Amino acid sequence: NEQCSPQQRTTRISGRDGLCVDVYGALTADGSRVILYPCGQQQNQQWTFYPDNTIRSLGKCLATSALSSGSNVVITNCDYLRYDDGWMVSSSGTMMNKSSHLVLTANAATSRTNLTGENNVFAAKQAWRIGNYVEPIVTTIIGLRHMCLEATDNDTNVWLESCVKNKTKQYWALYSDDTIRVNNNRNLCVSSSTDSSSKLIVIRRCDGSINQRWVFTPQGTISNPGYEAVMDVAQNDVYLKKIVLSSATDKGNGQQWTVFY
Protein backbone atom coordinates (compact mmCIF):
# COMPACT_ATOMS: atom_id res chain seq x y z
CA ASN A 1 0.00 0.00 0.00
CA GLU A 2 2.07 3.22 1.33
CA GLN A 3 5.33 1.72 0.07
CA CYS A 4 3.98 2.16 -3.41
CA SER A 5 3.97 5.97 -2.99
CA PRO A 6 7.37 7.01 -1.52
CA GLN A 7 7.10 10.67 -0.53
CA GLN A 8 10.78 11.44 -1.09
CA ARG A 9 14.24 10.11 -1.51
CA THR A 10 17.60 11.82 -1.11
CA THR A 11 20.34 10.55 -3.38
CA ARG A 12 23.23 11.76 -5.58
CA ILE A 13 23.39 12.35 -9.34
CA SER A 14 26.53 11.31 -11.18
CA GLY A 15 27.33 11.37 -14.88
CA ARG A 16 30.18 12.37 -17.18
CA ASP A 17 33.45 10.73 -16.06
CA GLY A 18 31.83 9.70 -12.76
CA LEU A 19 31.55 13.26 -11.41
CA CYS A 20 28.59 14.49 -9.39
CA VAL A 21 25.98 17.16 -9.90
CA ASP A 22 27.00 19.88 -7.45
CA VAL A 23 25.62 23.30 -6.48
CA TYR A 24 28.83 25.23 -6.73
CA GLY A 25 30.14 26.44 -3.34
CA ALA A 26 26.87 25.31 -1.72
CA LEU A 27 25.48 28.77 -2.55
CA THR A 28 21.73 29.17 -2.00
CA ALA A 29 20.86 32.40 -3.84
CA ASP A 30 18.31 32.01 -6.63
CA GLY A 31 20.17 31.17 -9.82
CA SER A 32 23.18 29.65 -8.04
CA ARG A 33 24.84 27.53 -10.77
CA VAL A 34 25.27 23.77 -10.80
CA ILE A 35 28.52 22.12 -11.98
CA LEU A 36 30.23 18.75 -12.16
CA TYR A 37 32.58 18.08 -9.28
CA PRO A 38 34.24 15.01 -7.75
CA CYS A 39 31.72 13.04 -5.71
CA GLY A 40 31.60 13.35 -1.94
CA GLN A 41 29.24 13.53 1.04
CA GLN A 42 28.59 17.30 0.98
CA GLN A 43 25.05 18.65 1.18
CA ASN A 44 25.36 20.55 -2.08
CA GLN A 45 25.57 17.17 -3.93
CA GLN A 46 22.45 15.68 -2.20
CA TRP A 47 19.42 15.78 -4.47
CA THR A 48 15.99 15.00 -3.07
CA PHE A 49 13.35 13.71 -5.47
CA TYR A 50 9.68 14.39 -4.75
CA PRO A 51 6.53 13.18 -6.52
CA ASP A 52 5.93 16.73 -7.87
CA ASN A 53 8.85 16.18 -10.36
CA THR A 54 11.17 18.53 -8.51
CA ILE A 55 14.78 17.70 -7.75
CA ARG A 56 16.11 19.68 -4.80
CA SER A 57 19.31 20.55 -3.05
CA LEU A 58 19.85 22.95 -0.13
CA GLY A 59 16.04 23.36 -0.09
CA LYS A 60 15.84 24.73 -3.65
CA CYS A 61 14.92 23.34 -7.05
CA LEU A 62 17.13 22.21 -9.91
CA ALA A 63 16.03 24.16 -13.02
CA THR A 64 17.01 25.39 -16.46
CA SER A 65 17.62 29.11 -16.77
CA ALA A 66 16.54 29.75 -20.32
CA LEU A 67 14.22 28.46 -22.99
CA SER A 68 16.93 28.01 -25.54
CA SER A 69 20.03 25.94 -25.25
CA GLY A 70 23.36 26.91 -23.74
CA SER A 71 22.40 28.58 -20.42
CA ASN A 72 23.27 27.25 -16.97
CA VAL A 73 21.23 24.83 -14.94
CA VAL A 74 20.70 26.38 -11.51
CA ILE A 75 18.88 26.06 -8.25
CA THR A 76 16.03 28.45 -7.48
CA ASN A 77 13.13 28.94 -5.07
CA CYS A 78 10.69 26.08 -5.66
CA ASP A 79 7.75 28.58 -5.44
CA TYR A 80 8.95 30.09 -8.76
CA LEU A 81 8.03 26.69 -10.34
CA ARG A 82 4.47 26.28 -8.89
CA TYR A 83 2.86 26.35 -12.37
CA ASP A 84 5.64 24.18 -13.95
CA ASP A 85 5.58 20.47 -14.89
CA GLY A 86 9.24 19.94 -13.83
CA TRP A 87 11.79 17.27 -14.72
CA MET A 88 11.24 13.96 -16.48
CA VAL A 89 13.98 11.33 -16.31
CA SER A 90 13.95 8.73 -19.06
CA SER A 91 14.65 5.04 -18.41
CA SER A 92 18.05 5.58 -20.07
CA GLY A 93 19.10 8.46 -17.71
CA THR A 94 18.27 11.47 -19.90
CA MET A 95 17.19 14.30 -17.57
CA MET A 96 14.71 16.53 -19.44
CA ASN A 97 12.83 19.72 -18.66
CA LYS A 98 9.27 18.65 -19.62
CA SER A 99 8.28 22.03 -21.04
CA SER A 100 11.39 23.10 -22.99
CA HIS A 101 12.69 19.61 -23.79
CA LEU A 102 16.24 20.81 -22.90
CA VAL A 103 18.36 18.17 -21.17
CA LEU A 104 20.98 18.36 -18.43
CA THR A 105 24.36 18.44 -20.17
CA ALA A 106 28.06 18.60 -19.23
CA ASN A 107 28.96 20.19 -22.57
CA ALA A 108 32.54 21.51 -22.35
CA ALA A 109 35.70 19.78 -23.61
CA THR A 110 36.44 19.14 -19.94
CA SER A 111 34.40 17.34 -17.25
CA ARG A 112 35.22 20.28 -14.91
CA THR A 113 32.34 22.26 -16.20
CA ASN A 114 29.19 24.24 -15.74
CA LEU A 115 26.09 22.16 -16.38
CA THR A 116 23.76 23.57 -19.06
CA GLY A 117 20.37 22.84 -20.64
CA GLU A 118 21.03 21.71 -24.20
CA ASN A 119 19.24 20.07 -27.09
CA ASN A 120 19.24 16.31 -26.63
CA VAL A 121 21.45 14.30 -28.97
CA PHE A 122 21.87 11.31 -26.59
CA ALA A 123 25.56 12.10 -26.00
CA ALA A 124 27.34 10.44 -23.09
CA LYS A 125 27.70 13.92 -21.68
CA GLN A 126 23.87 13.98 -21.48
CA ALA A 127 23.57 10.66 -19.60
CA TRP A 128 23.10 10.45 -15.84
CA ARG A 129 22.90 7.86 -13.08
CA ILE A 130 20.64 9.06 -10.31
CA GLY A 131 21.77 7.07 -7.29
CA ASN A 132 23.84 7.16 -4.15
CA TYR A 133 26.40 4.65 -5.39
CA VAL A 134 28.35 6.68 -7.92
CA GLU A 135 31.30 4.41 -8.69
CA PRO A 136 31.86 2.59 -11.96
CA ILE A 137 30.46 -0.90 -11.86
CA VAL A 138 33.17 -3.43 -12.76
CA THR A 139 31.83 -6.34 -14.83
CA THR A 140 32.29 -8.79 -17.68
CA ILE A 141 29.97 -8.45 -20.62
CA ILE A 142 28.76 -11.75 -22.03
CA GLY A 143 27.52 -12.17 -25.58
CA LEU A 144 27.20 -14.73 -28.36
CA ARG A 145 28.42 -18.33 -27.78
CA HIS A 146 28.55 -17.46 -24.07
CA MET A 147 31.72 -15.48 -24.71
CA CYS A 148 33.16 -12.37 -23.06
CA LEU A 149 33.95 -9.02 -24.70
CA GLU A 150 37.69 -8.39 -24.52
CA ALA A 151 39.76 -5.26 -25.12
CA THR A 152 42.33 -6.18 -27.78
CA ASP A 153 45.17 -4.80 -29.92
CA ASN A 154 46.59 -2.61 -27.14
CA ASP A 155 43.12 -1.42 -26.17
CA THR A 156 42.04 -0.22 -29.64
CA ASN A 157 39.66 -3.05 -30.63
CA VAL A 158 37.04 -5.22 -28.95
CA TRP A 159 35.61 -8.66 -29.75
CA LEU A 160 34.36 -11.88 -28.14
CA GLU A 161 36.72 -14.41 -26.56
CA SER A 162 36.16 -17.38 -24.22
CA CYS A 163 35.60 -16.11 -20.68
CA VAL A 164 38.61 -16.46 -18.41
CA LYS A 165 38.06 -15.37 -14.81
CA ASN A 166 40.34 -12.58 -13.80
CA LYS A 167 41.71 -12.05 -17.36
CA THR A 168 42.33 -8.33 -17.05
CA LYS A 169 41.14 -7.21 -20.49
CA GLN A 170 37.72 -8.86 -20.12
CA TYR A 171 36.71 -6.43 -17.33
CA TRP A 172 34.76 -3.29 -18.07
CA ALA A 173 33.87 -0.30 -16.00
CA LEU A 174 30.30 0.82 -16.43
CA TYR A 175 30.25 4.57 -15.74
CA SER A 176 27.43 6.89 -14.71
CA ASP A 177 27.47 8.53 -18.13
CA ASP A 178 26.58 5.20 -19.79
CA THR A 179 30.15 4.67 -21.03
CA ILE A 180 31.73 1.24 -21.10
CA ARG A 181 35.36 1.69 -20.14
CA VAL A 182 38.42 -0.50 -20.24
CA ASN A 183 38.69 -1.43 -16.59
CA ASN A 184 42.43 -0.84 -16.21
CA ASN A 185 42.47 2.17 -18.51
CA ARG A 186 39.47 4.18 -17.67
CA ASN A 187 40.35 6.91 -20.14
CA LEU A 188 39.32 4.53 -22.94
CA CYS A 189 35.69 3.95 -23.97
CA VAL A 190 33.90 1.41 -26.22
CA SER A 191 32.92 3.57 -29.24
CA SER A 192 30.80 3.19 -32.35
CA SER A 193 32.68 4.00 -35.53
CA THR A 194 33.62 7.61 -36.26
CA ASP A 195 34.23 6.61 -39.94
CA SER A 196 30.95 6.40 -41.85
CA SER A 197 32.40 3.64 -44.11
CA SER A 198 32.70 1.30 -41.12
CA LYS A 199 30.15 -0.09 -38.67
CA LEU A 200 32.92 -1.55 -36.49
CA ILE A 201 32.79 -0.88 -32.74
CA VAL A 202 36.26 0.02 -31.41
CA ILE A 203 37.94 1.50 -28.29
CA ARG A 204 38.87 5.16 -28.31
CA ARG A 205 39.70 7.98 -25.96
CA CYS A 206 36.62 8.93 -23.88
CA ASP A 207 35.17 12.14 -25.31
CA GLY A 208 31.54 12.33 -24.19
CA SER A 209 30.19 11.64 -27.67
CA ILE A 210 27.00 9.89 -28.87
CA ASN A 211 29.35 7.16 -30.05
CA GLN A 212 30.18 6.20 -26.52
CA ARG A 213 26.75 6.20 -24.86
CA TRP A 214 25.40 2.68 -24.30
CA VAL A 215 22.22 1.49 -22.62
CA PHE A 216 21.69 -2.03 -21.34
CA THR A 217 18.03 -2.54 -22.31
CA PRO A 218 15.50 -4.81 -20.59
CA GLN A 219 15.12 -6.71 -23.90
CA GLY A 220 18.76 -7.85 -23.65
CA THR A 221 20.49 -5.49 -26.13
CA ILE A 222 23.27 -2.90 -25.75
CA SER A 223 21.71 0.13 -27.43
CA ASN A 224 23.16 3.34 -28.73
CA PRO A 225 20.07 5.50 -28.39
CA GLY A 226 21.53 8.44 -30.39
CA TYR A 227 22.21 6.19 -33.39
CA GLU A 228 19.05 4.06 -32.88
CA ALA A 229 21.14 0.89 -33.19
CA VAL A 230 22.55 -1.89 -31.05
CA MET A 231 25.74 -3.87 -30.60
CA ASP A 232 25.83 -6.97 -32.79
CA VAL A 233 28.30 -9.75 -33.59
CA ALA A 234 29.26 -9.53 -37.28
CA GLN A 235 27.55 -12.30 -39.24
CA ASN A 236 26.59 -13.91 -35.90
CA ASP A 237 30.10 -15.30 -36.07
CA VAL A 238 32.36 -14.72 -33.09
CA TYR A 239 35.44 -15.93 -34.99
CA LEU A 240 35.30 -12.90 -37.28
CA LYS A 241 36.52 -10.77 -34.34
CA LYS A 242 34.08 -7.94 -35.17
CA ILE A 243 31.31 -6.31 -33.17
CA VAL A 244 29.24 -3.88 -35.22
CA LEU A 245 26.50 -1.35 -34.73
CA SER A 246 23.28 -2.55 -36.36
CA SER A 247 19.60 -1.87 -36.47
CA ALA A 248 17.81 -4.13 -33.91
CA THR A 249 16.56 -7.46 -35.39
CA ASP A 250 15.66 -10.86 -34.02
CA LYS A 251 17.20 -12.97 -36.77
CA GLY A 252 20.01 -14.58 -34.77
CA ASN A 253 21.26 -14.13 -31.23
CA GLY A 254 24.15 -11.78 -31.89
CA GLN A 255 22.35 -8.79 -30.39
CA GLN A 256 21.91 -10.46 -27.00
CA TRP A 257 24.20 -9.56 -24.16
CA THR A 258 24.24 -9.43 -20.43
CA VAL A 259 26.42 -8.37 -17.50
CA PHE A 260 28.24 -10.70 -15.19
CA TYR A 261 29.59 -8.70 -12.29
Next chain:
Amino acid sequence: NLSLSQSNFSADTYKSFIKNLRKQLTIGASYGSAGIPILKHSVPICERFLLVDLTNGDNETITLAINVEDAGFAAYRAADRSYFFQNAPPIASYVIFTDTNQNIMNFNNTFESIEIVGGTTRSETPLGIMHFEASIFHLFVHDENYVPTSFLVLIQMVLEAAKFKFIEQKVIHSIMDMEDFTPGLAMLSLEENWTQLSLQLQASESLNGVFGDSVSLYNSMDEPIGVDSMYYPILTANMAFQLYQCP
Protein backbone atom coordinates in the same frame (compact mmCIF):
# COMPACT_ATOMS: atom_id res chain seq x y z
CA ASN B 1 5.25 -29.17 -21.38
CA LEU B 2 8.36 -27.02 -21.55
CA SER B 3 11.05 -29.51 -20.65
CA LEU B 4 14.68 -30.14 -20.00
CA SER B 5 16.27 -33.64 -20.14
CA GLN B 6 19.68 -34.64 -18.78
CA SER B 7 20.54 -36.46 -22.01
CA ASN B 8 20.43 -33.17 -23.91
CA PHE B 9 21.91 -30.82 -21.41
CA SER B 10 24.26 -28.25 -22.90
CA ALA B 11 24.73 -24.61 -22.11
CA ASP B 12 22.69 -23.98 -25.30
CA THR B 13 19.70 -26.15 -24.37
CA TYR B 14 19.67 -24.86 -20.77
CA LYS B 15 19.77 -21.31 -22.03
CA SER B 16 16.88 -22.02 -24.44
CA PHE B 17 14.88 -23.65 -21.66
CA ILE B 18 15.32 -20.59 -19.36
CA LYS B 19 14.51 -18.21 -22.27
CA ASN B 20 11.27 -20.09 -22.98
CA LEU B 21 10.35 -20.36 -19.29
CA ARG B 22 10.58 -16.56 -19.04
CA LYS B 23 8.44 -16.18 -22.14
CA GLN B 24 5.76 -18.50 -20.80
CA LEU B 25 5.71 -16.82 -17.37
CA THR B 26 5.42 -13.35 -18.91
CA ILE B 27 2.41 -14.06 -21.13
CA GLY B 28 -0.02 -11.26 -20.21
CA ALA B 29 2.58 -9.42 -18.14
CA SER B 30 2.24 -5.67 -17.48
CA TYR B 31 5.05 -3.20 -18.25
CA GLY B 32 6.22 0.02 -16.64
CA SER B 33 8.91 2.60 -17.42
CA ALA B 34 11.75 0.15 -16.80
CA GLY B 35 10.25 -2.23 -19.39
CA ILE B 36 10.86 -5.30 -17.24
CA PRO B 37 7.70 -7.47 -17.36
CA ILE B 38 5.56 -7.67 -14.23
CA LEU B 39 4.02 -11.12 -13.60
CA LYS B 40 0.23 -11.50 -13.71
CA HIS B 41 -1.82 -11.18 -10.55
CA SER B 42 -5.26 -12.33 -9.38
CA VAL B 43 -5.01 -15.25 -11.83
CA PRO B 44 -7.92 -17.74 -11.68
CA ILE B 45 -6.71 -20.96 -10.00
CA CYS B 46 -7.46 -23.02 -13.16
CA GLU B 47 -4.93 -20.87 -15.06
CA ARG B 48 -2.40 -20.21 -12.27
CA PHE B 49 0.06 -23.12 -12.88
CA LEU B 50 2.67 -23.52 -15.55
CA LEU B 51 3.92 -27.13 -15.81
CA VAL B 52 7.52 -27.95 -16.66
CA ASP B 53 9.12 -31.35 -17.12
CA LEU B 54 12.55 -32.29 -15.90
CA THR B 55 14.08 -35.63 -16.86
CA ASN B 56 17.11 -37.17 -15.12
CA GLY B 57 19.81 -39.63 -16.29
CA ASP B 58 17.49 -42.66 -15.79
CA ASN B 59 14.85 -41.22 -18.16
CA GLU B 60 12.69 -40.59 -15.03
CA THR B 61 10.55 -37.43 -15.32
CA ILE B 62 9.03 -35.06 -12.78
CA THR B 63 6.49 -32.40 -13.61
CA LEU B 64 6.77 -29.25 -11.52
CA ALA B 65 3.93 -26.81 -11.18
CA ILE B 66 5.01 -23.18 -11.13
CA ASN B 67 2.69 -20.48 -9.76
CA VAL B 68 2.66 -17.91 -12.57
CA GLU B 69 1.94 -15.09 -10.03
CA ASP B 70 5.22 -15.52 -8.13
CA ALA B 71 7.45 -17.89 -10.17
CA GLY B 72 7.60 -20.34 -7.24
CA PHE B 73 7.05 -24.12 -7.15
CA ALA B 74 3.64 -25.10 -5.75
CA ALA B 75 3.80 -28.84 -6.27
CA TYR B 76 5.17 -31.63 -8.39
CA ARG B 77 4.27 -34.99 -9.85
CA ALA B 78 6.40 -38.13 -10.18
CA ALA B 79 4.67 -41.05 -11.93
CA ASP B 80 1.27 -41.59 -10.15
CA ARG B 81 2.26 -39.55 -7.07
CA SER B 82 2.22 -35.81 -6.36
CA TYR B 83 3.49 -33.58 -3.59
CA PHE B 84 2.18 -30.15 -2.59
CA PHE B 85 3.86 -27.56 -0.35
CA GLN B 86 1.93 -26.63 2.86
CA ASN B 87 1.57 -23.09 1.58
CA ALA B 88 0.47 -24.01 -1.93
CA PRO B 89 -2.78 -22.28 -2.77
CA PRO B 90 -5.47 -24.19 -0.84
CA ILE B 91 -7.40 -25.16 -3.99
CA ALA B 92 -4.38 -26.19 -6.10
CA SER B 93 -4.89 -29.92 -5.52
CA TYR B 94 -8.27 -29.86 -7.38
CA VAL B 95 -6.62 -28.22 -10.39
CA ILE B 96 -3.28 -30.00 -10.86
CA PHE B 97 -2.22 -33.65 -10.68
CA THR B 98 -5.80 -34.68 -10.01
CA ASP B 99 -5.29 -38.28 -11.24
CA THR B 100 -2.46 -39.08 -8.76
CA ASN B 101 -1.93 -40.07 -5.15
CA GLN B 102 -1.57 -36.58 -3.65
CA ASN B 103 0.60 -35.78 -0.64
CA ILE B 104 1.29 -32.74 1.48
CA MET B 105 4.90 -31.87 2.31
CA ASN B 106 5.01 -30.49 5.84
CA PHE B 107 6.93 -27.33 4.99
CA ASN B 108 6.52 -24.18 2.93
CA ASN B 109 8.04 -23.43 -0.51
CA THR B 110 10.22 -20.65 0.96
CA PHE B 111 13.97 -20.87 1.24
CA GLU B 112 13.62 -20.18 4.95
CA SER B 113 11.29 -23.14 5.53
CA ILE B 114 13.15 -25.51 3.24
CA GLU B 115 16.47 -24.71 4.91
CA ILE B 116 15.01 -25.35 8.38
CA VAL B 117 13.46 -28.72 7.48
CA GLY B 118 16.53 -29.94 5.67
CA GLY B 119 19.04 -28.61 8.22
CA THR B 120 21.15 -27.09 5.43
CA THR B 121 21.51 -23.69 3.75
CA ARG B 122 21.90 -22.60 0.17
CA SER B 123 25.45 -21.44 0.91
CA GLU B 124 26.49 -25.07 1.59
CA THR B 125 24.38 -26.71 -1.16
CA PRO B 126 26.34 -27.29 -4.35
CA LEU B 127 24.83 -26.51 -7.69
CA GLY B 128 25.81 -27.98 -11.07
CA ILE B 129 24.92 -30.94 -13.33
CA MET B 130 25.39 -33.79 -10.86
CA HIS B 131 23.18 -31.84 -8.48
CA PHE B 132 20.45 -30.95 -11.01
CA GLU B 133 20.31 -34.63 -12.05
CA ALA B 134 20.39 -35.97 -8.51
CA SER B 135 17.71 -33.51 -7.42
CA ILE B 136 15.28 -34.73 -10.11
CA PHE B 137 16.00 -38.26 -8.93
CA HIS B 138 15.47 -37.48 -5.22
CA LEU B 139 12.20 -35.76 -6.05
CA PHE B 140 11.13 -38.64 -8.36
CA VAL B 141 11.58 -41.23 -5.63
CA HIS B 142 10.69 -38.62 -2.90
CA ASP B 143 13.63 -39.57 -0.69
CA GLU B 144 12.61 -37.48 2.30
CA ASN B 145 16.21 -36.91 3.52
CA TYR B 146 17.11 -35.32 0.14
CA VAL B 147 13.83 -33.54 -0.81
CA PRO B 148 14.70 -30.20 0.87
CA THR B 149 18.17 -29.84 -0.71
CA SER B 150 16.70 -31.04 -4.02
CA PHE B 151 14.33 -28.10 -3.94
CA LEU B 152 17.15 -25.70 -3.01
CA VAL B 153 18.96 -26.93 -6.12
CA LEU B 154 16.05 -26.91 -8.58
CA ILE B 155 14.42 -23.65 -7.31
CA GLN B 156 17.78 -21.89 -7.89
CA MET B 157 18.86 -23.53 -11.17
CA VAL B 158 15.38 -23.19 -12.73
CA LEU B 159 13.32 -20.47 -11.11
CA GLU B 160 15.91 -18.06 -9.68
CA ALA B 161 17.84 -18.40 -12.96
CA ALA B 162 14.61 -17.39 -14.80
CA LYS B 163 14.27 -14.36 -12.47
CA PHE B 164 17.91 -13.21 -12.94
CA LYS B 165 20.23 -13.38 -15.91
CA PHE B 166 23.15 -13.26 -13.49
CA ILE B 167 22.07 -16.53 -11.95
CA GLU B 168 21.36 -18.03 -15.40
CA GLN B 169 24.96 -17.11 -16.36
CA LYS B 170 26.37 -18.71 -13.17
CA VAL B 171 24.63 -21.92 -14.08
CA ILE B 172 25.89 -21.63 -17.69
CA HIS B 173 29.51 -21.20 -16.38
CA SER B 174 28.92 -24.36 -14.30
CA ILE B 175 27.55 -26.49 -17.21
CA MET B 176 30.20 -25.42 -19.69
CA ASP B 177 33.03 -26.39 -17.32
CA MET B 178 31.16 -29.14 -15.43
CA GLU B 179 32.36 -27.16 -12.40
CA ASP B 180 30.06 -27.18 -9.39
CA PHE B 181 29.57 -24.07 -7.26
CA THR B 182 27.81 -22.83 -4.16
CA PRO B 183 25.99 -19.51 -4.54
CA GLY B 184 27.87 -16.55 -3.12
CA LEU B 185 26.56 -13.25 -1.82
CA ALA B 186 26.00 -11.93 -5.36
CA MET B 187 23.55 -14.73 -6.19
CA LEU B 188 21.94 -14.87 -2.74
CA SER B 189 21.37 -11.10 -2.60
CA LEU B 190 19.38 -11.27 -5.87
CA GLU B 191 17.26 -14.17 -4.54
CA GLU B 192 16.69 -12.37 -1.22
CA ASN B 193 15.63 -9.10 -2.88
CA TRP B 194 13.47 -10.13 -5.83
CA THR B 195 10.28 -9.03 -4.07
CA GLN B 196 11.86 -5.79 -2.74
CA LEU B 197 13.28 -4.89 -6.17
CA SER B 198 9.87 -5.52 -7.66
CA LEU B 199 8.24 -3.18 -5.14
CA GLN B 200 10.84 -0.42 -5.62
CA LEU B 201 10.81 -0.50 -9.37
CA GLN B 202 7.03 -0.19 -9.49
CA ALA B 203 6.94 2.39 -6.64
CA SER B 204 9.60 4.44 -8.46
CA GLU B 205 7.17 5.38 -11.25
CA SER B 206 6.06 8.26 -9.03
CA LEU B 207 9.67 9.47 -8.19
CA ASN B 208 11.32 9.73 -11.64
CA GLY B 209 12.73 6.20 -11.29
CA VAL B 210 14.19 6.75 -7.83
CA PHE B 211 13.43 4.11 -5.20
CA GLY B 212 11.82 4.60 -1.79
CA ASP B 213 14.48 2.41 -0.16
CA SER B 214 17.90 1.23 -1.30
CA VAL B 215 18.53 -2.46 -2.03
CA SER B 216 21.97 -4.04 -1.47
CA LEU B 217 23.19 -6.30 -4.28
CA TYR B 218 26.61 -7.90 -3.84
CA ASN B 219 29.10 -8.28 -6.67
CA SER B 220 31.36 -11.26 -7.24
CA MET B 221 34.06 -9.65 -5.02
CA ASP B 222 31.58 -9.59 -2.07
CA GLU B 223 31.21 -5.77 -2.25
CA PRO B 224 27.68 -4.45 -1.67
CA ILE B 225 26.30 -2.13 -4.34
CA GLY B 226 23.42 0.13 -3.31
CA VAL B 227 20.60 0.12 -5.82
CA ASP B 228 18.32 3.06 -4.98
CA SER B 229 17.00 3.68 -8.48
CA MET B 230 16.24 2.00 -11.76
CA TYR B 231 19.51 3.43 -13.23
CA TYR B 232 21.77 0.47 -12.34
CA PRO B 233 22.66 -2.01 -15.10
CA ILE B 234 23.20 -4.75 -12.48
CA LEU B 235 19.39 -4.56 -12.03
CA THR B 236 18.07 -3.59 -15.45
CA ALA B 237 20.29 -5.95 -17.50
CA ASN B 238 19.68 -8.72 -14.99
CA MET B 239 16.20 -8.99 -13.40
CA ALA B 240 14.06 -10.59 -16.12
CA PHE B 241 10.64 -10.16 -14.55
CA GLN B 242 9.01 -8.80 -11.40
CA LEU B 243 6.41 -9.75 -8.80
CA TYR B 244 3.27 -7.63 -9.16
CA GLN B 245 3.31 -5.09 -6.36
CA CYS B 246 1.73 -1.76 -7.15
CA PRO B 247 -1.33 -0.37 -8.91
